[PDB]
Design an enzyme around this catalytic site. Structure first.
Site, PDB file in Angstrom:
ATOM      1  N   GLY A  16       0.689  -1.432  -0.053  1.00  0.00           N
ATOM      2  CA  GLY A  16       0.104  -0.136  -0.019  1.00  0.00           C
ATOM      3  C   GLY A  16       1.006   1.328  -0.065  1.00  0.00           C
ATOM      4  O   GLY A  16       2.162   1.253   0.519  1.00  0.00           O
ATOM      5  N   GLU A  18       5.414   4.224   0.610  1.00  0.00           N
ATOM      6  CA  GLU A  18       5.124   2.959  -0.079  1.00  0.00           C
ATOM      7  C   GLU A  18       5.797   2.024   0.653  1.00  0.00           C
ATOM      8  O   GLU A  18       6.750   2.190   1.418  1.00  0.00           O
ATOM      9  CB  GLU A  18       5.980   2.844  -1.649  1.00  0.00           C
ATOM     10  N   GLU A  72       8.734  -5.376  11.078  1.00  0.00           N
ATOM     11  CA  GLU A  72       8.036  -6.819  10.959  1.00  0.00           C
ATOM     12  C   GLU A  72       6.797  -6.625   9.971  1.00  0.00           C
ATOM     13  O   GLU A  72       6.320  -5.472   9.654  1.00  0.00           O
ATOM     14  CB  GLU A  72       7.002  -6.454  12.402  1.00  0.00           C
ATOM     15  N   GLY A  76      -2.178  -8.718   8.970  1.00  0.00           N
ATOM     16  CA  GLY A  76      -3.576  -8.423   8.928  1.00  0.00           C
ATOM     17  C   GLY A  76      -3.904  -7.140   8.443  1.00  0.00           C
ATOM     18  O   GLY A  76      -5.252  -6.813   8.364  1.00  0.00           O
ATOM     19  N   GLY A  77      -3.011  -6.143   8.062  1.00  0.00           N
ATOM     20  CA  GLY A  77      -3.147  -4.990   7.145  1.00  0.00           C
ATOM     21  C   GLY A  77      -3.509  -3.973   8.285  1.00  0.00           C
ATOM     22  O   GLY A  77      -3.528  -4.017   9.275  1.00  0.00           O
ATOM     23  N   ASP A 117       0.406  11.485  15.318  1.00  0.00           N
ATOM     24  CA  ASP A 117      -0.301  11.151  14.013  1.00  0.00           C
ATOM     25  C   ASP A 117      -1.043   9.683  14.214  1.00  0.00           C
ATOM     26  O   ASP A 117      -1.088   8.777  13.389  1.00  0.00           O
ATOM     27  CB  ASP A 117       0.562  11.008  12.776  1.00  0.00           C
ATOM     28  N   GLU A 121      -5.065   4.230   9.688  1.00  0.00           N
ATOM     29  CA  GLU A 121      -4.005   3.875   8.873  1.00  0.00           C
ATOM     30  C   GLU A 121      -2.657   3.538   9.518  1.00  0.00           C
ATOM     31  O   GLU A 121      -2.042   2.682   8.808  1.00  0.00           O
ATOM     32  CB  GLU A 121      -3.783   4.947   7.904  1.00  0.00           C
ATOM     33  N   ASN A 122      -2.519   3.724  10.823  1.00  0.00           N
ATOM     34  CA  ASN A 122      -1.516   3.681  11.617  1.00  0.00           C
ATOM     35  C   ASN A 122      -1.431   2.753  12.744  1.00  0.00           C
ATOM     36  O   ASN A 122      -0.821   2.558  13.504  1.00  0.00           O
ATOM     37  CB  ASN A 122      -0.808   5.043  12.041  1.00  0.00           C
TER      38      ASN A 122
HETATM   39  N1  LIG Z   1       0.608   3.029   7.984  1.00  0.00           N
HETATM   40  C1  LIG Z   1       1.521   2.244   7.801  1.00  0.00           C
HETATM   41  N2  LIG Z   1       1.647   1.165   7.566  1.00  0.00           N
HETATM   42  C2  LIG Z   1       2.778   0.646   7.646  1.00  0.00           C
HETATM   43  C3  LIG Z   1       3.495  -0.735   7.358  1.00  0.00           C
HETATM   44  C4  LIG Z   1       4.887  -1.326   7.711  1.00  0.00           C
HETATM   45  C5  LIG Z   1       4.678  -2.254   8.982  1.00  0.00           C
HETATM   46  N3  LIG Z   1       4.252  -3.306   8.439  1.00  0.00           N
HETATM   47  C6  LIG Z   1       3.208  -4.111   7.590  1.00  0.00           C
HETATM   48  O1  LIG Z   1       3.208  -5.202   7.288  1.00  0.00           O
HETATM   49  C7  LIG Z   1       2.298  -2.957   6.817  1.00  0.00           C
HETATM   50  N4  LIG Z   1       1.388  -3.708   6.023  1.00  0.00           N
HETATM   51  C8  LIG Z   1       0.893  -2.759   5.046  1.00  0.00           C
HETATM   52  C9  LIG Z   1       1.528  -1.333   5.768  1.00  0.00           C
HETATM   53  C10 LIG Z   1       2.447  -1.861   6.623  1.00  0.00           C
HETATM   54  C11 LIG Z   1       3.520   1.250   8.371  1.00  0.00           C
HETATM   55  O2  LIG Z   1       4.804   1.297   8.844  1.00  0.00           O
HETATM   56  N5  LIG Z   1       3.051   2.762   8.660  1.00  0.00           N
HETATM   57 MG   LIG Z   2       2.698  10.048   9.009  1.00  0.00          MG
END
Ligand SMILES: NC1=N/C(=C2/CCNC(=O)c3[nH]ccc32)C(=O)N1
Ligand SMILES: [Mg+2]
Ligand SMILES: NC1=N/C(=C2/CCNC(=O)c3[nH]ccc32)C(=O)N1
Ligand SMILES: [Mg+2]
Lengths: 266, 266
Positions: A16, A18, A72, A76-77, A117, A121-122
């Site tokens: 997603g 990047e 890591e 689960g997304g 933040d 999404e986080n």
């Molecule tokens: N918002 C956000 N998503 C992150 C990750 C990085 C950390 N690990 C993930 O598996 C992951 N799956 C889809 C995006 C991620 C991330 O590090 N910040």
């Molecule tokens: Mg940010």
């Protein structure tokens, strides 16, 4: 991809934007790699110093040209994907995710860190199973809280740098507000503030959009917590400690489930 | 002293605290070397980017172990030394120093820099002659002002990060307050706020200590300017542009003297 990295990681598909899926070249273990193009210094320094089951761990880092942060993988997304579209979660799993969210954020705050933040999404999910671990991410904009002391201990200081000082110790309260917005969303499936009266006024006034028909599958205790985190006055607003003592989190079965999940991970 | 530096500079006597007098080894020109032991990064980046007759120039910089910043020597010493002890300056030279102070600070502000530590200890004098150039120093604590844009362009933001935003564009006003405290001192020889009702209240209320007997050798225009910089409301307080248009600075003879001094320096 820089030679040092490709040398260690087999790059792969997008998770997603990047963030890429990647496999360690020697073990074939899956990991995720956050690519930032050109306070990343800050992110890294933080991620290296912190150790907590609900806070994403960093595994590696490459600097030549773009930044690549190796993390890591969370199967689960992001939690965002569970809540888009008036979707919405079962109350008991809101409870489970939010317990974890409050422990993580309490842990930043006890270590003088404000996240700054927090949003769905986080918040990442350990697994595709409803009951799972959540790890918080994205320290791009965090603040590490000595320096009151030098301004105060004077005769030249503008009166507003002064006034401003009696605010010290309440900046962490922006994280608690944010957690209350997350909780609201999880519980209801819609956003409390939204341009669907203008965004700014909505928030400053503190008048979230309350839909009786929707909130009616939700307990009184849960809603009571949201109301207590959605307080405009930062002084009166709930801290993470208060929210953790709130009757809604006094649930030894969710408490149970969680320790169970900590154990599965080891 | 590190080998690279001693190799270039003959170190010498203290100019106060640490700032040392030093002579360039190849030319025997005098310079000053600020020693900081272990946002110096910030100071240097700033001093290198800025070019203005009333802002101290950096000539060199050594990092191995302590920081040494090599600077113009100012034979006149800090302005502090002219004002200690209810001493006090002749009105016309207050005018001359303050013109320069306002040009320097205007120049930081037009370049998105807030100084944040203006005080007489940080205004240096070109020469031992009453009429001389002043250069401002000490960027240890300055702020370089894009980032409103990312916070505003939302649904998760605490209502106080919001409120806070309509404050943007007024932080520079702490420099103007500080300049007004400097001016007050220069004109009168005493400090407007002082523990000689408590410091904090004094300043927030804005009630400076006004001594009629002392201020009576001072013109109405000059005092009118101080009052206009000592305003607690940052919105209403004078900016450097306003102060430069104020009748007190509409003096083509001091204007004359100054250009004269710029010329002597070349
Ligand atoms: N918002 C956000 N998503 C992150 C990750 C990085 C950390 N690990 C993930 O598996 C992951 N799956 C889809 C995006 C991620 C991330 O590090 N910040
Ligand atoms: Mg940010
Ligand atoms: N406050 C302050 N004083 C500074 C210097 C360094 C700049 N040049 C000087 O000559 C000098 N004389 C005595 C102290 C100094 C300085 O750099 N900051
Ligand atoms: Mg300083």
């Amino acid at each position: 991809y820089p030679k040092a990295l490709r040398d260690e990681y087999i790059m792969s598909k997008t998770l997603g934007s990047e963030v890429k899926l990647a496999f360690e070249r020697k073990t074939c273990k899956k990991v995720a790699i956050k690519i930032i193009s050109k306070n990343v210094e800050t992110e890294i320094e933080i991620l290296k110093k912190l150790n907590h089951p609900c806070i994403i761990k960093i595994k590696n880092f490459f600097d030549a040209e773009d930044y690549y942060i190796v993390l890591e993988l969370m199967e689960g997304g992001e939690l965002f994907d569970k809540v888009v579209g008036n979707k919405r979660l079962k109350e008991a799993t809101c409870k489970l995710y939010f317990y974890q969210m409050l422990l993580a954020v309490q842990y930043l705050h006890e270590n003088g860190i404000i996240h700054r933040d927090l949003k769905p999404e986080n918040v990442l999910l350990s697994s595709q199973e409803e009951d799972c671990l959540i790890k918080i991410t994205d320290f791009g904009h965090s603040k590490i809280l000595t320096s009151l002391m030098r301004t105060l201990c004077p005769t030249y200081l503008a009166p507003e740098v002064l006034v401003s000082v009696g605010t010290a110790g309440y900046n962490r309260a922006v994280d608690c507000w944010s957690l209350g917005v997350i909780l609201f969303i999880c519980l209801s499936g819609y956003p409390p503030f939204s341009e669907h009266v203008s965004l700014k006024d909505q928030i400053t006034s503190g008048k979230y959009n309350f839909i009786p028909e929707v909130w009616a599958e939700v307990s009184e205790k849960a809603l009571d917590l949201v109301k207590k985190l959605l307080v405009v006055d930062p002084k009166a607003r709930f801290t993470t400690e208060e929210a953790l003592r709130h009757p809604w989190l006094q649930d030894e079965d969710m408490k149970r489930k969680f320790q169970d999940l900590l154990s599965e991970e080891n």
